Amino acid sequence: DDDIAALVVDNGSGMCKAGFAGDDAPRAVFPSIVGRPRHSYVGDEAQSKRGILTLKYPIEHGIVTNWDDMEKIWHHTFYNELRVAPEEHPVLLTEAPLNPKANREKMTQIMFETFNTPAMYVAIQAVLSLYASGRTTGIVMDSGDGVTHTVPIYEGYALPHAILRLDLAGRDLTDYLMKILTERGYSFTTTAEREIVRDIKEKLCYVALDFEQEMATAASSSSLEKSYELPDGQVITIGNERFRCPEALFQPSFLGMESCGIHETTFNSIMKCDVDIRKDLYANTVLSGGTTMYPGIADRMQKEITALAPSTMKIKIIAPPERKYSVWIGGSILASLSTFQQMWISKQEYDESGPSIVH
Amino acid sequence: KRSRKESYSVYVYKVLKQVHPDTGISSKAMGIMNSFVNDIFERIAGEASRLAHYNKRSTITSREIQTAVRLLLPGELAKHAVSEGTKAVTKYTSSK
Amino acid sequence: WLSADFAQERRWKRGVARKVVRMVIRHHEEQRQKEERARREEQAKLRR
Amino acid sequence: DEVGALVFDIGSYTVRAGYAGEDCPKVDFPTAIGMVVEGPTYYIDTNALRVPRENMEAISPLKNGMVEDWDSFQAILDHTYKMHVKSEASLHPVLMSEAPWNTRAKREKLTELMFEHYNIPAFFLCKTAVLTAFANGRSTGLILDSGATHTTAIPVHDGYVLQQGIVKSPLAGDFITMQCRELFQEMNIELVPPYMIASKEAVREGSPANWKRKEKLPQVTRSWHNYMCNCVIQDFQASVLQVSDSTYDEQVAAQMPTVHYEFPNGYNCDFGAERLKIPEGLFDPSNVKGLSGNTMLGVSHVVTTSVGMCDIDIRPGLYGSVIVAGGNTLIQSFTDRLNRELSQKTPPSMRLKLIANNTTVERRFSSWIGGSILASLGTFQQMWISKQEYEEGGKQCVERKCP
Amino acid sequence: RAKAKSRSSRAGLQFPVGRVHRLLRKGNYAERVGAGAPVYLAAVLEYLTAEILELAGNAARDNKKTRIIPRHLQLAIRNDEELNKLLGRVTIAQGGVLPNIQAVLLPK
Amino acid sequence: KRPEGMHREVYALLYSDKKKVRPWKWMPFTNPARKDGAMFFHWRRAAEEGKDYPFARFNKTVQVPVYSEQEYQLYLHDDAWTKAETDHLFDLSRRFDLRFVVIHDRYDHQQFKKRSVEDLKERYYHICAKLANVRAVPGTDLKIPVFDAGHERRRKEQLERLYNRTPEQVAEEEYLLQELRKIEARK
Ligand SMILES: Nc1ncnc2c1ncn2[C@@H]1O[C@H](COP(=O)(O)OP(=O)(O)OP(=O)(O)O)[C@@H](O)[C@H]1O
Ligand SMILES: Nc1ncnc2c1ncn2[C@@H]1O[C@H](COP(=O)(O)OP(=O)(O)OP(=O)(O)O)[C@@H](O)[C@H]1O
Numbered sequence A: 001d002d003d004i005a006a007l008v009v010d011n012g013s014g015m016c017k018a019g020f021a022g023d024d025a026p027r028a029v030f031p032s033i034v035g036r037p038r039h040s041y042v043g044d045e046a047q048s049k050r051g052i053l054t055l056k057y058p059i060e061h062g063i064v065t066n067w068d069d070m071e072k073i074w075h076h077t078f079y080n081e082l083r084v085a086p087e088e089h090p091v092l093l094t095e096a097p098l099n100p101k102a103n104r105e106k107m108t109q110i111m112f113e114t115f116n117t118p119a120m121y122v123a124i125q126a127v128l129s130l131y132a133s134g135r136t137t138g139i140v141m142d143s144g145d146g147v148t149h150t151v152p153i154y155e156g157y158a159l160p161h162a163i164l165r166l167d168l169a170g171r172d173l174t175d176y177l178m179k180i181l182t183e184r185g186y187s188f189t190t191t192a193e194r195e196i197v198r199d200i201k202e203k204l205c206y207v208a209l210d211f212e213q214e215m216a217t218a219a220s221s222s223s224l225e226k227s228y229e230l231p232d233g234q235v236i237t238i239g240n241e242r243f244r245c246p247e248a249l250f251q252p253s254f255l256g257m258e259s260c261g262i263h264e265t266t267f268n269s270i271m272k273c274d275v276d277i278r279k280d281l282y283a284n285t286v287l288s289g290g291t292t293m294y295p296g297i298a299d300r301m302q303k304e305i306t307a308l309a310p311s312t313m314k315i316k317i318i319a320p321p322e323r324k325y326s327v328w329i330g331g332s333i334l335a336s337l338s339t340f341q342q343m344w345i346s347k348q349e350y351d352e353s354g355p356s357i358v359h
Numbered sequence B: 001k002r003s004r005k006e007s008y009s010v011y012v013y014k015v016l017k018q019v020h021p022d023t024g025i026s027s028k029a030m031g032i033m034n035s036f037v038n039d040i041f042e043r044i045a046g047e048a049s050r051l052a053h054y055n056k057r058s059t060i061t062s063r064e065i066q067t068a069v070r071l072l073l074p075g076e077l078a079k080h081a082v083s084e085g086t087k088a089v090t091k092y093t094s095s096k
Numbered sequence C: 001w002l003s004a005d006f007a008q009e010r011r012w013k014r015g016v017a018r019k020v021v022r023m024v025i026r027h028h029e030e031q032r033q034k035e036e037r038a039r040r041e042e043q044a045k046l047r048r
Numbered sequence D: 001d002e003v004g005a006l007v008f009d010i011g012s013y014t015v016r017a018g019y020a021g022e023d024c025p026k027v028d029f030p031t032a033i034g035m036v037v038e039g040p041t042y043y044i045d046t047n048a049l050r051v052p053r054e055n056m057e058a059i060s061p062l063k064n065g066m067v068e069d070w071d072s073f074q075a076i077l078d079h080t081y082k083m084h085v086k087s088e089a090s091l092h093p094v095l096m097s098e099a100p101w102n103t104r105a106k107r108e109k110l111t112e113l114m115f116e117h118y119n120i121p122a123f124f125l126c127k128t129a130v131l132t133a134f135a136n137g138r139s140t141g142l143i144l145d146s147g148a149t150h151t152t153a154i155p156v157h158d159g160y161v162l163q164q165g166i167v168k169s170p171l172a173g174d175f176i177t178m179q180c181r182e183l184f185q186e187m188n189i190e191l192v193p194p195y196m197i198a199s200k201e202a203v204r205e206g207s208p209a210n211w212k213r214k215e216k217l218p219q220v221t222r223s224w225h226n227y228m229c230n231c232v233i234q235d236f237q238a239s240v241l242q243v244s245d246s247t248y249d250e251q252v253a254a255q256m257p258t259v260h261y262e263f264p265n266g267y268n269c270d271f272g273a274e275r276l277k278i279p280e281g282l283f284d285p286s287n288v289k290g291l292s293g294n295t296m297l298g299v300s301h302v303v304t305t306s307v308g309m310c311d312i313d314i315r316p317g318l319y320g321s322v323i324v325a326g327g328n329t330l331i332q333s334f335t336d337r338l339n340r341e342l343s344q345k346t347p348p349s350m351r352l353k354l355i356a357n358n359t360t361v362e363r364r365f366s367s368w369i370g371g372s373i374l375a376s377l378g379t380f381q382q383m384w385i386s387k388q389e390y391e392e393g394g395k396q397c398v399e400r401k402c403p
Numbered sequence E: 001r002a003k004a005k006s007r008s009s010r011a012g013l014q015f016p017v018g019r020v021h022r023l024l025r026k027g028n029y030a031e032r033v034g035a036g037a038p039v040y041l042a043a044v045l046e047y048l049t050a051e052i053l054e055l056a057g058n059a060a061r062d063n064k065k066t067r068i069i070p071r072h073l074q075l076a077i078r079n080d081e082e083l084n085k086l087l088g089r090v091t092i093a094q095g096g097v098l099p100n101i102q103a104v105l106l107p108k
Numbered sequence F: 001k002r003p004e005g006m007h008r009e010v011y012a013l014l015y016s017d018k019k020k021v022r023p024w025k026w027m028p029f030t031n032p033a034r035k036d037g038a039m040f041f042h043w044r045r046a047a048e049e050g051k052d053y054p055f056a057r058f059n060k061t062v063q064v065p066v067y068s069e070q071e072y073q074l075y076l077h078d079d080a081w082t083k084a085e086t087d088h089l090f091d092l093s094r095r096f097d098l099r100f101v102v103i104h105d106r107y108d109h110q111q112f113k114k115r116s117v118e119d120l121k122e123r124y125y126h127i128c129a130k131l132a133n134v135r136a137v138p139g140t141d142l143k144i145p146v147f148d149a150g151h152e153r154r155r156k157e158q159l160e161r162l163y164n165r166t167p168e169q170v171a172e173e174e175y176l177l178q179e180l181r182k183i184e185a186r187k
Helices: A045-050 A071-080 A100-115 A125-129 A174-183 A191-200 A215-219 A262-273 A277-283 A297-308 A323-335 A338-343 A347-356 B007-019 B027-054 B061-071 B073-090 C004-047 D071-087 D104-116 D128-136 D173-189 D222-238 D299-308 D315-320 D334-345 D360-364 D364-376 D389-394 D396-400 E008-011 E017-026 E036-063 E070-079 E081-086 F008-015 F071-078 F083-095 F101-107 F117-132 F152-161 F165-187
Strands: A034-037 A052-054 D006-010 D014-018 D025-029 D094-098 D122-128 D140-147 D150-159 D167-169 D197-200 D211-213 D260-263 D270-272 D323-325 F023-028 F039-044
Touching: A034 A045, A034 D211, A045 A191, A071 A100, A125 A323, A125 C004, A125 F023, A174 A191, A262 A277, A262 D104, A297 D197, A323 C004, A323 D128, A347 F039, B007 B027, B007 E036, B027 B061, B027 D211, B027 E017, B027 E036, B027 E070, B061 B073, B061 D006, B061 E036, B073 E008, B073 E036, B073 E081, B073 F008, C004 D128, C004 D389, D006 D071, D014 D071, D014 D364, D071 D104, D094 D104, D094 D128, D094 D364, D104 D122, D104 D389, D104 D396, D122 D128, D122 D364, D128 D140, D128 D150, D128 D364, D140 D299, D140 D315, D140 D396, D150 D299, D167 D299, D173 D222, D197 D334, D222 D260, D299 D315, D299 D334, D323 D334, D360 D364, D360 E008, D389 D396, E008 E017, E008 E036, E017 E036, E036 E070, E036 E081, E070 E081, F071 F083, F083 F101, F101 F117, F117 F152
Parallel strands: D006 D094, D094 D122, D140 D323
Antiparallel strands: A034 A052, D006 D014, D014 D025, D140 D150, D150 D167, D197 D211, D260 D270, F023 F039
């Protein structure tokens, strides 16, 4: 029963979701970084020893390397298996937004060669995110940690002729926040230090007036400065980054890299989509990813999509209360779906078609 | 405006050619063959209906059809047909 | 040989992904139906 | 048999790039892109394109299926390679589509630019008509492609195009956009693109639009403004316009249910016979004002002329394998009107039949699906113009290696 | 949807399971029919047909004919022990009879 | 107690009536059918590494003779056809798999006077026949069946006269109906 034995693996630019599947939560997520000698480590140990290790992310906006690196992250994730991965391996693994042929074939090659599993499946993270709720279509923002997407997955199928992307709202957002804190006076210059700046997102992630929120709040800065907890006890009243770069998603020009504001980007995606399907695209706009945990994203997407869209079509936004791991939850459900058995790829057909299978 | 009438000639010829590659069949023989198929279909279906009515059941099932075949076919033909039907009902429910 | 294959694979794929998202809806329905089956088990304890 | 390659379909409206063997292209992005001297920069996916940015400049890289600016074409290629394809060009062959009326000079120049700049291991340049035929599953037939710039009937025989049988007409997406512009100007509809709108409110049908203009709009050129307006007009077309079943009759058109549409600025109204009177020019340009010319040929006229300019022995095959493709073919009842006119005008001695590839993906991406299935064949592995072929035969080997 | 598979092919039969089920369900036989009844019926009919066709082809080869005619059907039926009992009360047109001459009416 | 444990229908019917090594790899390969030695890639198995290209059998190009300079000057001479034109015609024939409907379109009308399809086909067949008629020893192709161009011109003319006849189709069909009518009446 591959459905009950299901396993999911998602690499991610910020945190690999390694964890046993079948339930509704991940188990052993890890920072997903690979360290090597300066002149191998992976996970928490590498994140700790960053000071003596050249670290690398095998995730380049979804792209990965084949022969050397990804196998280390897979070995670290192998803990989800019952330490018997060569026998307990009905696993579905990362599916980058759109690099289907090369990435899928090269990844399935490694998987079947290292584990020769009787169960595999290949679906873009978009479809897994949509299965978290289940409906006709999703234009999921899917803002995680590396990229942002507008995947219009109609009827569970990711229409590639309408998929659109955005890159500036990824890792470099943390560097922009670091520059903002430098202007403030902290002046961090390395990841080992701005890990706490990354953590600041846990509270400094609100935006109300996309056009003048930061100014209007600097004018009346009270009861809005959450005063993030610095290690040295410096509780200075953080009150400008509270509203600067949660809005950078809607205003790429605010950072320096230019692109359609996340809202108008999703809008252009559903516009390029079909006309009749565009009604369901408006009505079933999903929001997922770690970056979507910002409380204001829902309301701001509502407002911007209602301003950019016709009056007849409404915006029925749906942000799951646990959108942090909605993609992982939906993937685990799709894996441990009862009558989904027949759709798993197995050693039987691998031994006669290999990666020449549907990919 | 066509008045198309159905028949079992498309499958009676398939079975014929699979059980005898070199032997054919004429149109009159095909008609007699279709008549035989219709007659035995009627017989077996009526017997199954009778069994269902006797058991006070409004639906005919594979078991009624099996007992009807056992009743209709004589001796060493009944057993053959029943083994064929049983094997087919097991190869059909196995999703092959 | 291959032209009809892609046309067939397209209709099959949109059919396959279709029934996938489909059982997805039935699964979610089965979760609400799972809570309803738990309620039916409560009613069965009531009956016992 | 399968080999990791790159299929390119570079049309005057949109460019579709992807891998050979997939049912759909990896990335489809508009071709009417802008330009900004940051040097000249170009964008893809429409998210780096439809952005209000300082000093949006005009540019036209490819018109009528032919390269108009080699610099912008090379930039589009580089961007498609490094941004969305995200792979080195030396690792994947390149099968690129071309318009049948492309010149030998442009063919050889594209070949040399692909062999000396990107260093691709193999190259092939196929015609859009042959690709559409190969996609639809026919080796002989008439390809009817109504793009943004032109509507063309191209007869292909045994996988080869008959230039002397090709026919073209300028009545295309550009004509439809012009007609929509004229209709808006006659009905007093202010065409406001989205980038000029800050906020809007709901107003009653036919009432003026209550919208506020942005306060910090950047410098944009007339060309970029017209591009945004044409995008809005194309949305209006895809959402409103419909072809008349029979020859346009005002009385019958005034008895059709109206279609409601709301422009970005909030102005919402219903359209009656004016949405059906515009698409009539595609089939009968004699009733279009501002088009005082009878030499222009409608869609059915182009089809009939293309079939007639061919040998009489193959006209039955063309009539029986008439293939319809293009973006303009998605207009409601377009293929119905086309089939009606073709059954009326075609001699009954020759069987008429249109392929039912009516899906949006099947229509707009036919030329790319064709190249995909043509490059995903083992037989086609012998027609690849290799880097060694280019080095030995030179730029002129293209004419002999790929007709 | 998925590529539709016919019930006849799924079971392994040639006779039309769909048409057999249609007849069974719309006929006098019963109110509603189970999925297994028409499969079994078609299988039995196909077996009877294969048997009688084998016998008819054997008779045809014996008579030196390549086309099975009603003669080869009548001879087969009246030579077989069980098929004769099955079709005892059935007459076949242009089928004829067997050369069964009573031993008492022979030359002496 | 009932054993069962199997499918309901099958159960009732039956009782009620009692070392891995074979990785796929992105391997390069060469097609023997090609003459340029171009190297391609494919996801081959671990068993047929370096094996010949299976589709190489699909390289049976059309058969077209190749006349020489002396042979042409001696026998294939024609007042209305020059070498510049005949060589191009034969090149088109070899390139486009001997389909004259396409050879006519690929004809270079800018350097040679306009041509139909029938004249081109007649010229090609006459060349093929004359090349081999020089001797009886050639066994490849000696008696090429030169098609008829005279009757073909008529088959073209009196059929194009029927193609574009709009009301004449209906008129002819109606009179043919009436013809059968009174012919059956006079039978
Ligand atoms: N509650 C939160 N509020 C705001 N931002 C968050 C929150 N949780 C995580 N993030 C940010 O989101 C990023 C993680 O993205 P998420 O886990 O949603 O997708 P991901 O898997 O990390 O990205 P990818 O899918 O590309 O690997 C982190 O880098 C973190 O800075
Ligand atoms: N959904 C739609 N409904 C109606 N028309 C559409 C639709 N989508 C696109 N179009 C029209 O399609 C045209 C462009 O389509 P297409 O992609 O066929 O052009 P192309 O072939 O890529 O380029 P070219 O036309 O220069 O060859 C535009 O003029 C647009 O108006």
